[PDB]
Amino acid sequence: ILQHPDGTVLKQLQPPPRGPRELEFYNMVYAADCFDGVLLELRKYLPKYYGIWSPPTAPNDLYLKLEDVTHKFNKPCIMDVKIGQKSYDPFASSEKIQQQVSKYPLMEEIGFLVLGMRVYHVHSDSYETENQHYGRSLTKETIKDGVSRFFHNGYCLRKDAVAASIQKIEKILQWFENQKQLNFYASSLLFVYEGSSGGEVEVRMIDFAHVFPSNTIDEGYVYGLKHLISVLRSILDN
């Protein structure tokens, strides 16, 4: 992700077919002549989309120009969580399914996977970062404590950020329970809170290279959100 100073980021299109699909998703959702109520509501939960972008001298080099969801924070604490039971899409080959399931074989059981976090620590004036192997190591026994780490500034558990995250996720969950036209595979939620309040918490959906038309509720996504809500809720009892 390329963080530009004017409060936006540039996300480079993934190689085909993934980048092109993510481009088309943003184009469908943010079509100026769109009056589909489902899609207009979905806009609230995504980064604001500014269209395709490429460098002036390089029309070959394709990016999405997107809102920087961390812009309004001073010391943003950021967690990326992949949502759903299946990280592979409805047209994946046998090998691709195996590739995806092997990355994290607990996806069906847990319904979400922590892709990373960056946590500001007050008393050291520094960030602790966790990479993809952190989340991939978490089991049903360790997921609650694994998620909890995101909300530890060193001195207190930020239950305010936990509660606000639940409240923001619940609105996304409500959107999913009132649409039967899109199914989302390998998509994520980006959580941001202020590390330096309730207060600023941001929760946005990202990563749309495997969103497909559907005739049904996205059951895997709903399962993941519900399980994530339940884990966060249990952290409020700590």
Ligand SMILES: O=c1c(O)c(-c2ccc(O)cc2)oc2cc(O)cc(O)c12
């Ligand atoms: O706005 C965005 C953002 O700030 C970040 C980010 C910033 C710092 C990190 O350490 C990790 C991610 O990722 C993104 C990924 C997207 O697909 C879309 C976005 O709009 C953002």
